[PDB]
Amino acid sequence: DFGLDCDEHSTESRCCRYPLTVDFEAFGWDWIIAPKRYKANYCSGECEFVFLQKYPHTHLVHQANPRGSAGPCCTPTKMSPINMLYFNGKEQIIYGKIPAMVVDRCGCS
């Protein structure tokens, strides 16, 4: 409830999380055994005023408006791991939990 989820049917301008399936075979990640595909999701949309901002720093910097400071951008504020079975660099079969593969939540930073 900390973020917005959208889909293809949404008409949402704000920073929002959308669906996306990643298919490893199609990406060239041929060392992965399982899973073959997974829902990674992604973040998209606008960051105006302080909408969807969790950190006071963000708007403090925007008002200070210093040189080189771009506007805030829509970005993951929470990530989740996925469990994978894959071949390591020695071609051994390894089960491991791989951090930060999935976006759980999007916000403006």
Partner: protein, 278 residues
């Protein structure tokens, strides 16, 4: 007023969504947590409350009860302990014929398929049954569904997986002394074997009689396996931070220290068992 994505546990509004909206506009969807505040205030006042006072005060939740809440697929609305509507996992378990435990992809045993579907919904969106029954050690009497096949990981856990049966038509030498024409081929054969074979070194296998016959590359060093009469190129670049008995029948302080000694001496060492050889 202002529209917020949530009422915090302290009861105040957080996560600004929109300004200059009436309650009717802010609350016009089925989204569970959306909340509203009446007051329109200047920026600084807003910041004052959001940052230094725990959120905007007089936060009014759009949904006071389960009426009109749209939890989405496989979820239902139920009032919680603090009397607030909540979306809770309610998977349809109605068409499930298998009644016993199941082994999830995560390698964990679930009580039954209904419990796995709950964990999928609650925590692990990529969770699925990989095979029926409890999760197993070794592939002995593991019968994988359909045309998937059994392999074990580094801890002897059994998984049912689909082997990449078709490689695209970079030589490698496996620790089995077999030359493979690519990674894909070595991996395919590993999958069919059901356990790691392991990469010995890049290029074609040679009938080495010692490490002198093997020219490692990529900053690797040759380790000789006296049990099988074959060599192996290993990185030897890892640093070390439960004593083990190695295949040389010596005790090392750690599996990591054993690897350091293997690497130093050019002799392949494997853990035989835990604790001192003596």
């Amino acid at each position: 007023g202002n529209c917020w994505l949530r009422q915090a546990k302290n009861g105040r509004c957080q996560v600004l969504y929109k300004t200059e909206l009436s309650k009717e506009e802010c609350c016009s969807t089925g989204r569970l947590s959306t909340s509203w505040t009446e007051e329109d205030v200047n920026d600084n006042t807003l910041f004052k409350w959001m940052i230094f006072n725990g959120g905007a005060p007089n936060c009014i939740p759009c949904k006071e009860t389960c009426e009109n809440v749209d939890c989405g697929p496989g979820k239902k609305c139920r009032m919680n302990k603090k009397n607030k509507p909540r979306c809770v996992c309610a998977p349809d378990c109605s068409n499930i014929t298998w009644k016993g435990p199941v082994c999830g992809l995560d390698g964990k045993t679930y009580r039954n398929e209904c419990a796995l579907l709950k964990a999928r919904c609650k925590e692990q969106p990529e969770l699925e049954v990989q095979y029926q029954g409890r999760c197993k050690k070794t592939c002995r009497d593991v019968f994988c569904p359909g045309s998937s096949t059994c392999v074990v990981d580094q801890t002897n856990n059994a998984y049912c997986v689909t082997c990449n049966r078709i490689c695209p038509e970079q030589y490698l030498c496996g620790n089995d002394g077999v030359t493979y024409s690519s990674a894909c081929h070595l991996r395919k054969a590993t999958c069919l074997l059901g356990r790691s074979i392991g990469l010995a070194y890049e290029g074609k296998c040679i009938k080495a009689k010692s490490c002198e016959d093997i020219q490692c590359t990529g900053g690797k060093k040759c380790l000789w396996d006296f049990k099988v009469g074959r060599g192996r190129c290993s990185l030897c670049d890892e640093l070390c931070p439960e004593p083990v008995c190695a295949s040389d029948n010596a005790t090392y302080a750690s599996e990591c220290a054993m690897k350091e000694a293997a690497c130093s001496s050019g002799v392949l060492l494997e853990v035989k068992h835990s604790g001192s050889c003596n």
